[PDB]
UniProtKB/TrEMBL annotation, chain C:
This is Complex I-49kD. Belongs to the complex I 49 kDa subunit family. It comes from the Eukaryota. Signal peptide: none annotated.
TrEMBL record, chain F:
The chain crosses the membrane at residues 30-47. It comes from the Eukaryota. Core subunit of the mitochondrial membrane respiratory chain NADH dehydrogenase (Complex I) which catalyzes electron transfer from NADH through the respiratory chain, using ubiquinone as an electron acceptor. Essential for the catalytic activity and assembly of complex I. This is NADH-ubiquinone oxidoreductase chain 5. The chain holds residues 530 to 577 of 577 of the full protein. It is found in: Mitochondrion inner membrane. Belongs to the complex I subunit 5 family.
UniProtKB/TrEMBL annotation, chain G:
It comes from Drosophila melanogaster (Fruit fly). GO terms for cellular component: mitochondrial inner membrane; respiratory chain complex I. Its main location: mitochondrion. Belongs to the complex I NDUFA11 subunit family. This is NADH dehydrogenase [ubiquinone] 1 alpha subcomplex subunit 11. The keyword Transmembrane applies. It is a multi-pass membrane protein. PANTHER family: NADH DEHYDROGENASE [UBIQUINONE] 1 ALPHA SUBCOMPLEX SUBUNIT 11 (PTHR21382:SF1), NADH-UBIQUINONE OXIDOREDUCTASE SUBUNIT (PTHR21382). The lineage of its organism: Eukaryota, Metazoa, Ecdysozoa, Arthropoda, Hexapoda.
């Protein structure tokens, strides 16, 4: 893991040297007033992109976070099958996946997986 | 609870989380039970047609999440130093555990969230907040044998919860400040006898659970709504307002009994000065109880003219009057009880 | 009938909370994002400016 | 000294995270990020405790689950602010 | 040497995190904080599992928080300060010097690694994450796992109840 | 006797309740900062 | 292990001076710092680095005046007459009330506070000469009612124990 | 909303009607019985409207007969002055104080400038509230729509008509505005409103079509007052309701016929408002889940004492709406000792009720 740190620092160093070599060998022309402006398909913007953005999938994002920490408890049981009671392992595993199916199909029934609109 | 079966589910997970907390033989199981209780009690207390209920839910969330993280921090420190679940001699990490528990319970000087948040609630969620949500932090205080910090909390709670309730004319914040004052009597009983604390908590929750039903049914969110409250007989309003003299500790009502058993168990355990400090506190609590009792004791009032009939639920008002009888004539059951021997 | 029992200098400027506990949120004006499918956009066929 | 050389650091970082949680900030989402930081330092201290013991590190995922559900509760409270207010300013909420 | 470097980097990023008003500065600071915390946690355990688990958790969480940054407080000014840069640079170089002149046996963690365990330990010769994660699926504590499944289902029900999807999308001044 | 008794006790308790009501007029971050200060006090004495 | 780590009643009254000053000013420091810590953030916020320390000094220093004046008045009244008694504590309480009156520029507060602190002093002197304690350690501490062993309601079965009451 | 002729006969219900007057509907009753299993195109609230004399009762009865709906006439003060036993309480006024005497519609017409008339207006709003939940108990629990002769939304215009004519002060206006702000937000706005437009003079001609004595010898029915109602209706109330309800305005100078009014209703497409979930039309009556339908039915069946106890607000600065305490005790000892209201209306032995020894039943949503 100490070697992975050093090779990650080396990849970061090599990519910074590559980007600085792209910046040094770039054509150096004078900066125009309207060259630097945001594109906005060729016209004036009327609004900055720091304007607040409407979120229609907030429930889907929080359900994604809940389901991801549910992912964090599935990943052990690859290893645990060979070293545990088979009965207890099957009761926990089939009950885990069936509870996830009850939750996902129940929110499919309510329509909470559809975007707000 | 009301208008949804998912609120009954939230009550079920509330009871499950609190009973997981108080039965835990480790601080980590108690901590995860507090997480379950917090998860259960955020959706009750949230209503999108009320602008202040969401702010009250946010205040409860921030206060409980700050208090739960300090509780886990000092629990981990206690396991780091004294590797069992408890501590042999008392140290500062036990005081940090007790302070993080006192922020959950709402005792002074960590009381400031409690009546500032109770303005945003209904009455049933107020009753769940100041009775059942005080099961889990107060029962976890019992594992800590700290006298000075608990004594400071008792003195500050009975001083502030009496003084602070004088200014508010709203019944929710006044009853929250009353619950702060009755919290000090619970914490004073917590270091002499756990059974006497359980009895004071049961009778305090009984008097809270009968005083909520008078305010929940008729929607009495202000002091002058009591003066404008219509009854078909003024003797009925005179009898229904005797529960405030019960909660003030006046004999021969039922609420004299738990205060009296706390005073008897405190004097047997040779505490006299803080008991005397709690005598002067409950006079002020009885004083701001009497401003409610102005609305029924003068027998005739300049009342509003347009309202002519009073309306109530069937089962809620049926269950209300069983307990109003026992909050007045409850000292005739002194021979039946056998806990106090 | 006041907001409190004893109005101070700061406190007396308050109003009474409503007797109904429910306060409905107000409907505020919303300004949505003005994005144009301008002329350079390939879906706008070269010379169309959709001010979405 | 032994409490100073080992595990004194995440107490200091947890205190700094607590001071970041209670500092006067304009938005609630900064307090949510400070909550994520104190989850990280509680994970550090709990991980030190569970790694003094040999095979009791299975508990370290349960704390992650209760902390993520705390963060999901905070995110849903941040959604429920928009149902009543138009903003997440802490000055815009009611002080009483 | 690497552990003391991670100590110094975590201290410097914690000083940076306590001083940042803007939510994206807090997000990037806690990105590098959870990177350094994930590496440090790995040093203590025989295997490197829970660092990976914590990294999936804290990258699944702030992915959502950026959407709430762009929906609420999208427009807020960054303010670079020379005092914070000078303070962080001086403290960082001072702690790298102090870590270089320190004895690293005394400052090392006493928690046992996979190679710090002795040869006679027959439990160390198994697969590296088997006996650590076993008690999630064993008989005394499977019921806590059952409680966690039901707790996550109740959490999802709470999220659905207090984020009403039919009230519309969320933004500033909705 | 009324200066050392009921009426002036009522005036003193009304003044103290007016002062304590101004303690509750701030945001939650002040009280949470007070709790964080109290935890920091108990953690400094753990070193001492 | 210094002169700051001293108590008020480690010596008989009138024998020691500086330890009593340090002890009573230590309780004054603790009360003033606690009240000013719950003051300067909560009501009348100073909004400055220097007026915060000014409010700290305003809430701390008069309590040092109370502590020093009461302890010096009790020391003078103990060193004047042979007998130790309660009215030395009473006139020390009146001196602390006079310090309160000098703080608040109100003689009536100074007297009433002198009477209240004199009553507190004579009650504390009754405590120290009669032997009873204000906040004693609790002798009777009920951790439950009767049958606390008999109400174990657990569904798991107990494995056989490794300890016996039988002598070897 | 299909009529009787396009349907091919009488209306058939989509499911069994719930006995809402006999069985209490609560949270635990919401699992077995669901609200939206009975709703159809005929399950809508229709409120007929208009001036003082416009033939609203006969037209609303014919509209209820043709559309197969329940007819709800306008509430008068004989609902509380005449109790469930038929005893009129207008004969108790010698014993009552003059500030507590009976005041009805004819007492307003003979004496407009009386103080309690302001109370009368407030009382009328409560009575309209007391039928509107009774409207919303009928639509949600049985699935058959209702027709209302007047609405609780339609009663602030009468308050402002008394105020501009001088019969009410600023204080009674502020009180009635405070009760309206306290109470109207819990109601659901009606689906459709029918306004019978009439000129100011012709209504007076219709007064001569009624020939009742207290409305022809009175003073209130003048040119300025009926113009004030017409202006108040057409400039505030109908413009506020037309953002939610499909407004239908007819001229009723002639006799009119209810069949063309029926045939204009089926030309309205009520499904065009369901494309947008944030549409202001039919906003209060759309529910995305069955549980929200049961939530509204629980709020309107089990929480009618809640909505009636929302009227308990304190207002003491006015001297027209505050009853004297001696007069209040005298009023209590006369009114509640009268025959027919000594006890709860089920358990009154003085009016011939039998079997009181074994009876323990009470009425659901019953005034005590
Ligand atoms: C007990 C133990 C603990 C005790 C703790 C006590 C200390 C903390 C107390 C804090 C109290 C407090 O609230 O303070 C606030 C107070 C006010 O804060 P501020 O700085 O005014 O405002 C900050 C903005 O609000 C900030 O607002 P913003 O969010 O808009 O700012 C944007 C933000 C945005 O920041 C970010 O996005 C974070 C970026 C972090 C990584 C940067 C890497 C750079 C690599 C090159 O930028 C920064 O924060 C600047 C960061 C610059 C880069 C730092 C590089 C070094 C650290 C590297 C860390 C490790 C990462 C390495 C890379 C890893 C890659 C995987 O803070 C201070 O006053 C700071 C302390 C200053 C003390 C004195 C310093 C020395 C003297 C200076 C003058 C010398 C003059 C000499 C004259 C000589 C000639 C006469
Ligand atoms: C001032 C007193 C005089 C006032 C003048 C008027 C006369 C009144 C009657 C005088 C009685 C005789 C005088 C005397 O010396 O009595 C000692 C005596 C104390 O008992 P003791 O026999 O010395 O031993 C007590 C314990 O066994 C052993 O106690 P300990 O040594 O274990 O105690 C530790 C000590 C150690 O103190 C310290 O460490 C503080 C000083 C160090 C510097 C701190 C700097 C800031 C923090 C930095 C942290 C790093 O800390 C404290 O005592 C803290 C007290 C805090 C009180 C307020 C708490 C509020 C908490 C709110 C948040 C929760 O009695 C009194 O103090 C009672 C009189 C004062 C109250 C009168 C109320 C009158 C109402 C009308
Ligand atoms: C993971 C991969 C991340 C890849 C991008 C890294 C970007 C590094 C930026 C470092 C900036 C350092 C600095 O001083 O910043 C101050 C500056 C101050 O702005 P400035 O414009 O005042 O700085 C100009 C400075 N001079 C004049 C000296 C040239 O701020 C920035 O550069 C903006 C930082 C934005 C950070 C966005 C983080 C997004 C995180 C998303 C997930 C979490 C939610
Ligand atoms: C300025 C305010 C300073 C407050 C300092 C409080 C210190 C304190 O409580 O110490 C603990 C002490 C504890 O006292 P104690 O009785 O436990 O002390 C015995 C100590 N040993 C065992 C070492 C000998 O509290 C007191 O002394 C309280 C005394 C109160 C006296 C006044 C009563 C009447 C009040 C007016 C009516
Ligand atoms: C309702 C809860 C009933 C059970 C409560 C309980 O066991 O309380 C502890 C005791 C009996 O428990 P116990 O006999 O096991 O002893 C107490 C020991 N602990 C609490 C540690 C288990 O009951 C009471 O004190 C009475 C509580 C109910 C109040 C009286 C009216 C009924
Ligand atoms: C012990 C626990 C008892 C309660 C168990 C509840 C399980 C289902 C929880 C849930 O979320 O159900 C979804 C929905 C509840 O109604 P909901 O739409 O959440 O609320 C709208 C009104 N505010 O429920 C439905 O739409 C289904 C109908 C009601 C529930 C029937 C099954 C549980 C009966 C008990
Ligand atoms: C020597 C005896 C000192 C106490 C005397 C009795 C206290 C008492 O009855 O006070 C009366 C007071 C209400 O005062 P009231 O007369 O109603 O109002 C006058 C308007 N300024 O009521 C109160 O002040 C009620 C609170 C009394 C608290 C006593 C214990 C704490 C000190
Ligand atoms: C320790 C027990 C102290 C008991 C004190 C009893 C008397 C009291 O409360 O006095 C406070 C005093 C009242 O002053 P006042 O009535 O305004 O008179 C003005 C003219 N003298 O007010 C003052 O003198 C100013 C404020 C009090 C400062 C000195 C007393 C401090 C007492 C210890 C506080 C401990 C921390 C409390 C934290 C509370 C948080 C909510
Ligand atoms: C017999 C014992 C019980 C007596 C209770 C009633 C008397 C309480 C003490 C009191 O009121 O003393 C008077 C004195 C007046 O102080 P001053 O600031 O001048 O008054 C402002 C008036 N609004 O007040 C003070 O100096 C304040 C003293 C602090 C303790 C007050 C306790 C109440
Ligand atoms: C700039 C860093 C970007 C983020 C990198 C995230 C890597 C995955 C998260 C993690 O903790 O992985 C644990 C893993 C643990 O290692 P492994 O368990 O993958 O492999 C054992 C290792 C020589 C047997 C294979 O460590 C890394 O991936 C090193 C990260 C280096 C970061 C350098 C800069 C500080
Ligand atoms: N003061 C007062 N009088 C009212 C109010 N509402 C109705 N009235 C009186 C005015 C007239 O005397 C009488 C007319 O009743 P309506 O306008 O409801 O119609 P009416 O009963 O004539 O039925 P109709 O339209 O002819 O079928 O009722 C009110 O709010 N206040």
């Amino acid at each position: 893991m100490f070697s992975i740190i050093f090779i990650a620092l080396l990849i970061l160093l090599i990519t910074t040297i590559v980007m600085f070599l792209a910046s040094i060998l770039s054509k150096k022309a004078l900066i125009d007033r309207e060259k630097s402006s945001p594109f906005e398909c060729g016209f004036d913007p009327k609004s900055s992109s720091r304007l607040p953005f409407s979120l229609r999938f907030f429930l889907i994002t929080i359900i994604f976070l809940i389901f991801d920490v549910e992912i964090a408890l599935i990943l052990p049981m690859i290893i645990i099958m060979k070293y545990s009671n088979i009965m207890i392992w099957t009761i926990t595993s089939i009950i885990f996946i069936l509870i996830l199916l009850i939750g996902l199909y129940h929110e499919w029934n309510q329509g909470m997986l559809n975007w707000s609109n | 609870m009301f208008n949804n079966s998912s609120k009954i589910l939230f009550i079920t997970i509330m009871i499950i989380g609190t009973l997981i907390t108080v039965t835990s033989n480790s601080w980590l199981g108690a901590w995860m039970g507090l997480e379950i209780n917090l998860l259960s009690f955020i959706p009750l207390l949230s209503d999108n047609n009320n602008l202040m209920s969401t702010e009250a839910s946010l205040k409860y969330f921030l206060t409980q999440v700050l208090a739960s993280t300090v509780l886990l921090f000092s629990s981990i420190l206690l396991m780091l130093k004294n590797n069992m679940n408890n501590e042999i001699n008392e140290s500062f990490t036990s005081m940090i555990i007790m302070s993080a528990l006192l922020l959950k319970s709402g005792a002074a000087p960590f009381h400031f969230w409690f009546p500032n948040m109770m303005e945003g609630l209904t009455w049933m969620n107020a009753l769940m907040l100041m009775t059942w949500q005080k099961i889990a932090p107060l029962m976890l205080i019992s594992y800590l044998n700290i006298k000075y910090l608990l004594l400071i909390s008792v003195i500050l709670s009975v001083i502030i919860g009496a003084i602070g309730g004088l200014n508010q004319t709203s019944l929710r914040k006044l009853m929250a400040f009353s619950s702060i004052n009755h919290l000090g009597w619970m914490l004073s009983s917590l270091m002499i006898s756990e059974s006497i604390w359980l009895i004071y908590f049961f009778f305090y929750s009984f008097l809270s659970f009968v005083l909520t039903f008078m305010f929940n049914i008729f929607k009495l969110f202000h002091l002058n709504q009591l003066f404008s409250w219509f009854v078909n007989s003024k003797i009925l309003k005179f009898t229904l307002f005797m529960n405030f003299l019960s909660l003030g500790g006046l004999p021969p009502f039922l609420g004299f009994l738990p205060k009296w058993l706390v005073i008897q168990q405190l004097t047997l355990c040779n505490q006299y000065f803080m008991l005397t400090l709690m005598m002067m506190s409950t006079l002020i609590t009885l004083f701001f109880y009497l401003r409610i009792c102005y609305s029924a004791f003068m027998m005739n009032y300049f009342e509003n003219n347009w309202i002519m009939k009073m309306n109530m639920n069937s089962i809620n008002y049926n269950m209300y009057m069983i307990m109003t009888f026992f909050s007045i004539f409850g000292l005739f059951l002194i021979s039946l009880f056998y806990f106090m021997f | 009938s006041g907001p409190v029992m004893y109005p101070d200098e700061v406190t007396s400027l308050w109003t009474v909370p409503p007797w109904n506990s429910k306060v409905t949120p107000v409907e505020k004006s919303v300004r949505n994002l003005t994005l144009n499918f301008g002329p350079q956009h390939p879906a706008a066929h070269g010379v169309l400016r959709l001010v979405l | 000294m032994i409490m100073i050389l080992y595990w004194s650091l995440p107490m200091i970082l947890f205190i700094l995270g607590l001071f970041c949680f209670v500092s006067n900030r304009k938005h609630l989402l900064s307090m949510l990020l400070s909550l994520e930081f104190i989850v990280l330092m509680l994970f550090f201290m709990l991980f030190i405790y569970l790694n003094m013991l040999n095979y009791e590190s299975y508990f370290s995922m349960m704390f992650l689950t209760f902390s993520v559900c705390e963060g999901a509760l905070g995110l849903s409270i941040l959604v429920s602010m928009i149902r009543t207010h138009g903003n997440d300013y802490f000055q815009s909420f009611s002080i009483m | 040497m690497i552990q003391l470097m991670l100590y110094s980097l975590i201290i410097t990023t914690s000083i940076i995190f306590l001083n940042m008003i803007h939510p994206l500065a807090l997000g990037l600071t806690l990105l590098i904080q959870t990177i350094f915390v994930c590496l440090l946690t790995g040093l203590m355990t025989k295997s490197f599992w829970y660092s990976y688990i914590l990294f999936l958790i804290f990258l699944g969480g702030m992915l959502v928080l950026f959407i709430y940054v762009t929906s609420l407080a999208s427009n807020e000014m960054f303010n670079l300060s020379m005092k914070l840069t000078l303070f962080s640079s001086l403290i960082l170089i001072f702690m790298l010097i102090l870590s270089f002149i320190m004895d690293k046996t005394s400052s090392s963690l006493f928690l046992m690694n996979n190679d710090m365990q002795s040869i006679i330990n027959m439990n160390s010769y198994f697969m590296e994450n088997s006996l650590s994660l076993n008690k999630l699926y064993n008989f005394p504590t499977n019921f806590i796992t059952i409680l966690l499944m039901n707790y996550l289902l109740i959490t999802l029900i709470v999220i659905v109840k207090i984020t009403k999807l039919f009230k519309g999308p969320i933004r500033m001044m909705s | 006797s009324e200066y050392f008794g009921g009426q002036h006790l009522y005036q003193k308790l009304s003044m103290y309740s007016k002062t304590l009501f101004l303690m509750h007029n701030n945001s939650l971050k002040i009280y949470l900062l007070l709790f964080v200060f109290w935890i920091l006090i108990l953690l400094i004495l753990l070193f001492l | 292990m210094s002169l700051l780590r001293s108590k008020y009643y480690d010596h008989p009254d009138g024998e020691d001076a500086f330890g009593k000053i340090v002890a009573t000013n230590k309780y004054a420091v603790s009360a003033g710092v606690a009240w000013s810590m719950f003051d300067v953030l909560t009501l009348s916020k100073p909004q400055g680095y220097l007026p915060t320390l000014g409010r700290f000094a305003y809430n701390t220093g008069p309590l040092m005046g109370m502590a020093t004046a009461f302890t010096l008045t009790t020391l003078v009244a103990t060193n004047a007459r042979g007998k130790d008694d309660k009215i030395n504590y009473l006139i020390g309480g009146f001196a602390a009330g006079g310090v309160f009156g000098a703080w608040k520029h109100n003689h009536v507060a100074g007297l009433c506070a002198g009477l209240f602190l004199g009553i507190a002093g004579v009650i504390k002197k009754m405590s120290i000469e009669q032997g009873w304690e204000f906040f004693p350690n609790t002798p009777i501490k009920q951790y439950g009612g009767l049958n606390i062993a008999g109400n174990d309601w657990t569904i798991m079965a107990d494995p056989p124990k490794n300890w016996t009451t039988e002598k070897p | 909303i299909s009529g009787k002729t396009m349907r091919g006969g009488p209306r058939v219900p989509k499911a069994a009607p719930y006995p809402y007057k006999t069985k209490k509907y609560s949270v635990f009753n919401a699992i077995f019985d669901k609200t939206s299993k009975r709703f159809d195109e005929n399950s809508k609230v229709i409120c007929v409207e208009g001036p003082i004399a416009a033939g609203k009762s006969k037209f609303a009865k014919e509209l209820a007969e043709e559309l197969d709906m329940e007819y709800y006439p306008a509430v008068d003060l004989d609902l509380i002055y005449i109790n469930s036993y038929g005893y009129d309480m207008r004969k108790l006024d010698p014993q009552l104080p003059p500030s507590c005497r009976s005041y009805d519609v004819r007492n307003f017409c003979l004496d407009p400038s009386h103080d309690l008339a302001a109370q009368f207006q407030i009382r009328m709003y409560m009575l309209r509230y007391s039928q509107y939940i009774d409207a919303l108990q009928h639509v949600l629990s049985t699935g058959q729509g209702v027709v209302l002769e007047r609405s609780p939304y339609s009663d602030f215009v009468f308050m402002e008509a008394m105020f501009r004519q001088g019969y009410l002060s600023r204080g009674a206006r502020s009180v009635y505005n405070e009760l309206r702000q306290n109470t109207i937000g819990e109601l659901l706005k009606p689906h459709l409103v029918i306004y019978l437009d009439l000129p100011v003079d012709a209504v007076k001609k219709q007064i001569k079509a009624r020939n009742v004595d207290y409305e022809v010898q009175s003073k209130v029915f003048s040119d300025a007052y009926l113009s004030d109602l017409e202006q108040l209706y057409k400039q505030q109330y109908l413009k506020d309701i037309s953002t939610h309800a499909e407004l239908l305005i007819y001229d009723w100078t002639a006799g009119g016929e209810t069949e063309v009014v029926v045939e204009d209703i089926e030309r309205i497409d009520f499904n065009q408002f369901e494309a947008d979930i944030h549409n202001k039309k039919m906003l209060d009556w759309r529910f995305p889940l069955e549980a929200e339908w049961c939530e509204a039915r629980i709020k309107y069946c089990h929480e009618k004492p809640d909505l009636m106890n929302y009227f308990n607000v304190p207002r003491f600065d006015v001297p027209e709406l505050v009853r004297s305490a001696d007069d209040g005790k005298v009023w209590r000892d006369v009114w509640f000792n009268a025959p027919g209201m000594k006890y709860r209306p089920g358990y009154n032995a003085d009016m011939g009720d039998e079997g009181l020894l074994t009876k323990t039943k009470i009425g659901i949503n019953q005034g005590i």
